[PDB]
Design a protein around this nucleic acid. Structure first.
Ligand SMILES: [Zn+2]
Lengths: 263, 338, 158, 96
RNA sequence: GGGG
DNA sequence: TATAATGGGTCTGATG
DNA sequence: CATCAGAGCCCCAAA
C-alpha cells in the first residue's frame, strides 16, 4: 500500500512473496498459532493454558499470556505474560489495609510474643500496640488513606479586601487550588484513556499535592508561591510550633480591658 | 525522591520512533478510527461507546469508569455484553473489531513515544505561574489531542503537528490556572499586551510610561482610564501569612460589642413604639420599611393585605409616623441613634 | 450576609432554613462560613501523610512495610503485588506483597522482547516467523540476545 | 499593638500566674469574655452598660477554629458529656 | 532593628 | 490546527 | 549511624 495510488506494488501475475532487507528484526518471547476460519479472541485479550483462540475451538493456547491477532500473517500470537495484579500508590495500600483482619493479626503477633531473641518480642509489641489501638477504638486502618479530602470553612482561610482595595488571601487557598487542578486534570486524563506513564505521573503529583496541603515540607521540597522562597503555610504549620494555634491562641490570647504604660 | 528526575527516567524507557514505526502507528490509529465508524453503522450503537469498550479491553481491567459523554455506565458487566455483541459478528464484520483494537494499542505507544517532545517544550514555559510538572501534564494533554487529529497522509513528521497542540495546551493552562483570581483567557491576553507594550515604551523612554503613553500605544478605544482599570483587575492577591501581614487586618464583618449593643438597644427602644401605636398601624410600617420581608412593599402591594387602597394606607402610615413623632420630644430616646 | 441569599430573592429572617431556588443559598447567620465544611472527591485515593511519615510509620508498621518500601509504592517507584496469578520472576514464583521494579513488572505483565537494527541494505540470515536460540546470529553484524519468534519489521525489498 | 488600638497579650506565662494564684474565674474571663467568646464578650458589654453583673461565658471561638482545623486534617474531634454522648458546640449550624 |  | 522540533536547572537529644 | 523536633517573655516602629 502507499500514500497515493501510484507507487503501489500491484502483483502482475501469479507468484509467491519473499521478504529481504528488513529495517530491523524484533525477537519476541511468544508462541505462534496459525488459523483457517474465524478467530474468537481479539488482540489485547489475556489467556492462560487451555483457552480457545480460533477455528471454533480447535487451536488452543499452550502458554500464558497476551493475544496479538495478526491478519497480515493469519496467525494468533500469544506473548508469554501473566495476568498479574500489581499496583502502585495509595490505591494499593488502601486495599491491603482493607484486607486486614485485625483480630487474626493480634493472635499471630501474640503467638510470637513467646519467642526469645529480644528483638522479636519487641517488634511484635510495637505492632500489637498499633493493632490493639485500632481494635479498642473502632477505627479502621484503611481510614489513614483519603478518598474524600475535607475542605476547611472559608472564613478560616479568608479572602478579604484590605484598605487599599487589594486582596489578601490565606495560603490554604493556593494549596487547595493546587490539589483541585491536579485532581480535575486526573479525572480528564482517565476518561481520555491516557497511557500508563502519564496517569502515574499525575497520581504522584496528586499525592504530592495532598501532602503539601496537610504538612508542606515534611516530604520533598516545600511548595512556594512563585518569586518568593517562603514555604506555604500548610495545615500542620498552623497547628503547631510557638506560632501555632495551641500556644499562640488557646493557651494564651490577647485581651480586652487592658493597657500598658511606663512605670 | 525528585519527581522531575523520576519522570525523566520513565520517559527514557520508551525508545523514540523511527520514521517508519512513526507512520505505521499513526496509520493503525487512523484505520482504527475508521473501523469504529464502520463498526457503529453495522452494530447500530454509539461510536463513542464502542471506542470506549475497545479501550477498556486494551488498557486492562485496571481502568473501568463512567465516561461522562457516554450514556451507559461502564461497569465490567456492560463491557462484557458489548464485547460479546462484537464477537457475535461474521468474519467479514468481526474483522473491524481487530482493527479498532490494533488502533487503540498503537495510539498508546504513539503517545508514550512522544513524551520527550513535550518535556523540551514545557521547559521553556517555566515560572509563569505553574510548576515544571504541571506544565508537562498540561503539554501531555495536547499530545493526546495531536494523536487523534494527526493526518499521516500529509507526509508531515508527527513532531511538527504535536508542537502546535502542546504549545496550545500549555499556553492555555498558564492563562487558566495561574491566578488565585481566575481571569478569562482573552482578558489575560490583553493584560499581557499592556505589559509588553509598557515595557517597550519604558525601553525607549528611559522611564516608566504614564497611563496616557500606554493608552496611546495600545491604540484606538484605549484611554488612560481603561489602562488604570485594566491594572486594577490585573492585581494578584497578597498572602495573609506574608511576614504576619494578616495580624494587622481587623475583621469588619462580625459586629463588635458596641454595635451588637446599640443594635439590640434600637430594637428594644423601637418595640416601645409597636405598643403606643396599635397592631395594624405598627405593621403597615413593617411592610413599607421592610421589617418582615426585607424589601419595601409599596402602598400598592400592601393594599392586598388589609383591603385598603393607596390612600388609606397613606393615612394609615402617616397617622403612625405623626403619632410616633409626638412620642419623640417626650421620650427623646431615638435622637442620638444615628 | 446575615439572612440573605446570593441573588437577593429572600433577604430577611422571615425565611430561615429555606434554600433559594434561583441561586441555591440558604438563609441563615453568615457565621456558618466559619463552620461549614466542604470536600474534594479524589479520583484515586491519597495517603494521609501524618500516617506515612510520622516515624515509625503507622501504615508501615501495621503492614510490615519498611520506610523505603512505603515511599516506593506510594510515590510510584515500585509495584506491590496483590495477586500473582501464577506469575514467576527469574524462577521463584511471585509471592504476594512482593515489590517489583518497573522492569520486573513489564516482564511479567507484557512479556519480553528486543529489537536489533540492521545496517542499511545488509540482509538477514534468518527469516520471518522462525524460532531462535539465545546468542543465535540474526544478521552479519547482529546476534540475538534472547529466545523466541523473530519478526521482520519493514522489509525494504520485496 | 498601640497603632491598631490593640489588646495586651496574656501569654502562657501570665496564664500560669493566674493558675498559681488559683484565680479560676479571673482566668476564665481572660480566655472568653475579654477575648474571643463572641457570645459572652458581646453579652458582657451589654451587662456593664446596663449595670448587670457579667454573664457566664460560652465557648471561645478560637476553639471552634481548632476543631474545624482538625476536621480539615481528617481528624474527628468530639465534645462529649459524661454519658459519652456528643455535645454540639456549633449549636446545630454545622450539621445537616 | 530598638525597649525592659 | 501540518517545515522540524523528542530527558531540568548550629546543637543537642531521642529513636529505627 | 540517619532523621526529626526542639531551642524565654512582653512591647515598639516598620511594612
Ligand atoms: Zn437567591
Amino acid at each position: 500500500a502507499a500514500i497515493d495510488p501510484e507507487e503501489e506494488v500491484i502483483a502482475e501475475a501469479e507468484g509467491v512473496v519473499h521478504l529481504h532487507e528488513p529495517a530491523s528484526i524484533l525477537v519476541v518471547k511468544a508462541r505462534v498459532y496459525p488459523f483457517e476460519d474465524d478467530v474468537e479472541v481479539s488482540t489485547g485479550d489475556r489467556v492462560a493454558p487451555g483457552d480457545v483462540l480460533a477455528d471454533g475451538g480447535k487451536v488452543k493456547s499452550d502458554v500464558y499470556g497476551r493475544v496479538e491477532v495478526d491478519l497480515v500473517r493469519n496467525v494468533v500470537r500469544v506473548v508469554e505474560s501473566y495476568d498479574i495484579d500489581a499496583r502502585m500508590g495509595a490505591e494499593a495500600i488502601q486495599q491491603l489495609l482493607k484486607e486486614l483482619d485485625l483480630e487474626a493479626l493480634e493472635k499471630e503477633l501474640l503467638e510470637e510474643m513467646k519467642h526469645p531473641s529480644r528483638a522479636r518480642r519487641a517488634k511484635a509489641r510495637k505492632r500489637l500496640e498499633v493493632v490493639r489501638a485500632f481494635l479498642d477504638s473502632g477505627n479502621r486502618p484503611e481510614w489513614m488513606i483519603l478518598e474524600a479530602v475535607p475542605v476547611l470553612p472559608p472564613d478560616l482561610r479568608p479572602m478579604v479586601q484590605v484598605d487599599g482595595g487589594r486582596f489578601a488571601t490565606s495560603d490554604l487557598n493556593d494549596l487547595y487550588r493546587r490539589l483541585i487542578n491536579r485532581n480535575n486534570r486526573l479525572k480528564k486524563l482517565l476518561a481520555q484513556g491516557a497511557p500508563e506513564i502519564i496517569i502515574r505521573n499525575e497520581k504522584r503529583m496528586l499525592q504530592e499535592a495532598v501532602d503539601a496541603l496537610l504538612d508542606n515540607g515534611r516530604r520533598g521540597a516545600p511548595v512556594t508561591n512563585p518569586g518568593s522562597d517562603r514555604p506555604l503555610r500548610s495545615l500542620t504549620d498552623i497547628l503547631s510550633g510557638k506560632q501555632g494555634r495551641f500556644r499562640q491562641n488557646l493557651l494564651g490570647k490577647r485581651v480586652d480591658y487592658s493597657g500598658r504604660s511606663v512605670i | 525522591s525528585d519527581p522531575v528526575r523520576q519522570y525523566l527516567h520513565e520517559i527514557g524507557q520508551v525508545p523514540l520512533l523511527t520514521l517508519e514505526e512513526e507512520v505505521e502507528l499513526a496509520r493503525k490509529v487512523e484505520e482504527g478510527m475508521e473501523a469504529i465508524k464502520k463498526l457503529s453503522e453495522i452494530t447500530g450503537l454509539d461510536p463513542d461507546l464502542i471506542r470506549e469498550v475497545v479501550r477498556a479491553k486494551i488498557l486492562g481491567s485496571a481502568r473501568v469508569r463512567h465516561i461522562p459523554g457516554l450514556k451507559e455506565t461502564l461497569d465490567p458487566k456492560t463491557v462484557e455484553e458489548i464485547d460479546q455483541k462484537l464477537k457475535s459478528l461474521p468474519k467479514e464484520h468481526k474483522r473491524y473489531l481487530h482493527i479498532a483494537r490494533e488502533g487503540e494499542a498503537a495510539r498508546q505507544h504513539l503517545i508514550e513515544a512522544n513524551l520527550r517532545l513535550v518535556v523540551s517544550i514545557a521547559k521553556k514555559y517555566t515560572g509563569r505561574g505553574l510548576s515544571f510538572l504541571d506544565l508537562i501534564q498540561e503539554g501531555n494533554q495536547g499530545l493526546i489531542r495531536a494523536v487523534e487529529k494527526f493526518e499521516y497522509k500529509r507526509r508531515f513528521k508527527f513532531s511538527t503537528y504535536a508542537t502546535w497542540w502542546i504549545r496550545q495546551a500549555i499556553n492555555r493552562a498558564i492563562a487558566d490556572q495561574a491566578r488565585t483570581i481566575r481571569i478569562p483567557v482573552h482578558m489575560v491576553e490583553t493584560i499581557n499586551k499592556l505589559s509588553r507594550t509598557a515595557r517597550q515604551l519604558q525601553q525607549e523612554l528611559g522611564r516608566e510610561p504614564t497611563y496616557e503613553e500606554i493608552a496611546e500605544a495600545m491604540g484606538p478605544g484605549w484611554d488612560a482610564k481603561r489602562v488604570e482599570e485594566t491594572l486594577k483587575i490585573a492585581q494578584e492577591p497578597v498572602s495573609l501569612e506574608t511576614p504576619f501581614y494578616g495580624d494587622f487586618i481587623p475583621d469588619e464583618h462580625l459586629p463588635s460589642p458596641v454595635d451588637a449593643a446599640t443594635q439590640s438597644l434600637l430594637s428594644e427602644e423601637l418595640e416601645k413604639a409597636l405598643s403606643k401605636l396599635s397592631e395594624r398601624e405598627a405593621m403597615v410600617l413593617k411592610l413599607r420599611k421592610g421589617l418582615i420581608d426585607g424589601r419595601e412593599h409599596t402602598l400598592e402591594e400592601v393594599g392586598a393585605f388589609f383591603g385598603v387602597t393607596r390612600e388609606r394606607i397613606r393615612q394609615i402610615e402617616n397617622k403612625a409616623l405623626r403619632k410616633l413623632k409626638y412620642h419623640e420630644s417626650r421620650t427623646r430616646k431615638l435622637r442620638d441613634f444615628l | 450576609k446575615d439572612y440573605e441569599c446570593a441573588c437577593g430573592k429572600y433577604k430577611r429572617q422571615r425565611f430561615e432554613g429555606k434554600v433559594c431556588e434561583r441561586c441555591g443559598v440558604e438563609v441563615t447567620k453568615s457565621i456558618v462560613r466559619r463552620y461549614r465544611m466542604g470536600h474534594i472527591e479524589l479520583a484515586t485515593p491519597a495517603a494521609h501523610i501524618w500516617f506515612v511519615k510520622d516515624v515509625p510509620s503507622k501504615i508501615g508498621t501495621l503492614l510490615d512495610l519498611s520506610a523505603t518500601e512505603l515511599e516506593q509504592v506510594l510515590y510510584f517507584s515500585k509495584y506491590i503485588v496483590l495477586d500473582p496469578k501464577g506469575a514467576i520472576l527469574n524462577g521463584v514464583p511471585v509471592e504476594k506483597r512482593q515489590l517489583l521494579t518497573d522492569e520486573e513488572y513489564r516482564e511479567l505483565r507484557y512479556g519480553k522482547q528486543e529489537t536489533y537494527p540492521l545496517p542499511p541494505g545488509v540482509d538477514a540470515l534468518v527469516k520471518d516467523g522462525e524460532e531462535v536460540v539465545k546468542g543465535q546470529e540474526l544478521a552479519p553484524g547482529v546476534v540475538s540476545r534472547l529466545d523466541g519468534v523473530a519478526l521482520y519489521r519493514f522489509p525494504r525489498r520485496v | 499593638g498601640k497603632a491598631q488600638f490593640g489588646g495586651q497579650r496574656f501569654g502562657e506565662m501570665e496564664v500560669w500566674a493566674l493558675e498559681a494564684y488559683g484565680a479560676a474565674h479571673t482566668l476564665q474571663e481572660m480566655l472568653t469574655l475579654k477575648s474571643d467568646d463572641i457570645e459572652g464578650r458581646n453579652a458582657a458589654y451589654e451587662a456593664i452598660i446596663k449595670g448587670e453583673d457579667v454573664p457566664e461565658p460560652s465557648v471561645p471561638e478560637s476553639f471552634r477554629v481548632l476543631v474545624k482545623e482538625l476536621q480539615a486534617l481528617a481528624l474527628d474531634v468530639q465534645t462529649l458529656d459524661e454519658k459519652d454522648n456528643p455535645v454540639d458546640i456549633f449549636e446545630g449550624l454545622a450539621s445537616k
